[PDB]
Design an enzyme around this catalytic site. Structure first.
Site: not given
Ligand SMILES: NC(=O)C1=CN([C@@H]2O[C@H](COP(=O)(O)OP(=O)(O)OC[C@H]3O[C@@H](n4cnc5c(N)ncnc54)[C@H](O)[C@@H]3O)[C@@H](O)[C@H]2O)C=CC1
Ligand code: NA
Length: 398
Positions: A50-51, A74-75, A111-112, A139, A235
């Site tokens: 995604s993204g 990770y999904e 999981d990376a 990530l 941020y």
């Protein structure tokens, strides 16, 4: 079952899986219509579902290079209570489209942060895929497990030296609301740095380099954000900002090593603010993005994920023109966001914003649509009155 957009705890409960298919296809169609670029042939993306990571994958596969890709994400899929994540389905439909075009599209739903995951990917590269010329680390995680020690580091979005309270946009209620963010302890700062800093990226790069997985002159990129003073507190000068500075520091170390060993390179690309699953939940980000959308659309310089990535690759990284970094060695894709006239207008609108007028002064409509779209809702060419077969959906594989 007729899937409707609904909220639980401020989160969309069920995504529309076929909407996700359409949204993947929309990004593919943008890349097919683009002028095209050439360069990468074999690409590894961590955070590919995604993204920015999904846009990266779609760009290299469909934007000209016809690149084979490995995606690590990770999904989770359909259970007896949940339909599955947007990213779960994005992986599946990307693969469907890439296969039809005759491209390799390998998915590791893993999981990376794991040493096990790195070994699996390295094994696949050496045995089947062939050496990588581009590695993108994209990530966004709430936590990191150290599989050797069993320690878990938790990422927290907090301020440093003073609590914050400021307006945000609540999409559930179409309303401006005040959001409080508290000061982080030194331990919380460190844990966020552990999760969202450059340590894991660096480890991936070292393991890849040292197991002979990179092509000569390979490139590696991670994504960052700087933003405006409107968001420095929560941020850039908060816990996440300290993590991103660690990411930028690691880029320099990775760059030195890759250059020395294979003539390769590493850098951070500082990207623009936009709506993704991760960013949608950064405190106040919805309000900033909504005003920014308004200003940049009026100035004809608005970009979403795929437009950002397509410009980055075709105009800066794999262009005729030589790449230009800022004075800190970072690629700047927030070049238009941080343009003086843009920021002047954003600041002026910001000062006039109230709970009563925000929909008039900001592009809330555009913000909400992009938010809905990434979850498969509010898209053209999707029949939202059609029932979905859950058994059919659960049989789909990444
Ligand atoms: N969205 C924004 O406004 C901006 C985002 N960025 C950066 O872009 C990068 C990607 O974020 P977005 O695309 O916005 O978020 P996203 O939520 O759309 O993507 C997150 C990706 O990370 C993966 N992921 C999370 N934990 C994982 C894990 N443990 N193992 C494997 N994969 C995992 C997810 O599966 C997903 O593919 C982040 O580093 C973010 O800080 C930079 C500038 C702006
Ligand atoms: Na991503």
């Amino acid at each position: 079952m007729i899937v409707k957009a609904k909220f639980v705890k401020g989160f969309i409960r069920d995504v529309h899986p076929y909407g996700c298919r359409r949204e993947v296809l929309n990004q593919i169609d943008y890349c097919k219509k683009a002028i095209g670029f050439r360069g990468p042939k074999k690409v590894l993306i961590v955070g590919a579902s995604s993204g920015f990571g999904l846009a990266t994958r779609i760009s290299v596969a469909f934007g000209g290079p016809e690149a084979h890709t490995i995606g690590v994400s990770y999904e989770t899929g359909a259970t007896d209570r949940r339909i599955g994540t947007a990213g779960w389905y994005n992986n599946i439909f990307f693969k469907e489209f890439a296969k039809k075009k005759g491209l390799v599209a390998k998915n590791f739903i893993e999981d990376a942060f794991s040493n096990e995951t790195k070994d699996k990917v390295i094994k696949y590269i050496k045995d089947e895929f062939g050496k990588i010329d581009l590695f993108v680390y994209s990530l966004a995680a709430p936590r990191r497990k150290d599989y050797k020690t069993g320690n878990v580091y938790t990422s927290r979005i907090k301020t440093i030296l003073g609590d914050f309270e400021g307006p945000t946009i609540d999409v559930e209620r179409d309303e401006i609301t005040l959001k409080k963010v508290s000061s982080a302890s030194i331990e919380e700062i460190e844990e966020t740095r552990k999760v969202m800093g450059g340590e894991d990226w660096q480890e991936w790069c070292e393991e890849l380099l040292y197991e002979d997985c990179f092509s000569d002159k390979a490139t590696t990129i991670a994504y960052s954000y700087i933003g405006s003073p409107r968001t420095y507190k929560i941020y850039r000068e908060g816990t996440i900002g300290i993590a991103k500075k660690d990411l930028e520091d690691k880029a320099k170390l990775i760059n030195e090593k890759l250059n020395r060993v294979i003539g390769g390179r590493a850098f951070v690309s500082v990207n623009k603010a936009l709506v993704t699953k991760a960013s949608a939940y950064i405190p106040t980000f919805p309000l900033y993005a909504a005003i920014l959308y308004k200003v940049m659309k009026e100035k004809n310089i608005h970009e979403n994920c795929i437009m950002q990535i397509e410009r980055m690759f075709s105009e800066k990284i794999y262009s005729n023109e030589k790449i230009q970094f800022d004075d800190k060695g970072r690629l700047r894709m927030d070049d238009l966001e941080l343009r003086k006239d843009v920021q002047d207008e954003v600041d002026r609108i910001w000062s006039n914003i109230t709970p009563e007028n925000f929909k008039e002064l900001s592009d809330y409509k555009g913000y909400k649509k992009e938010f809905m779209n990434l979850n498969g809702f509010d898209l053209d060419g999707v029949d939202y009155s059609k029932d979905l077969d859950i058994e059919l959906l659960r049989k789909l594989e990444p």
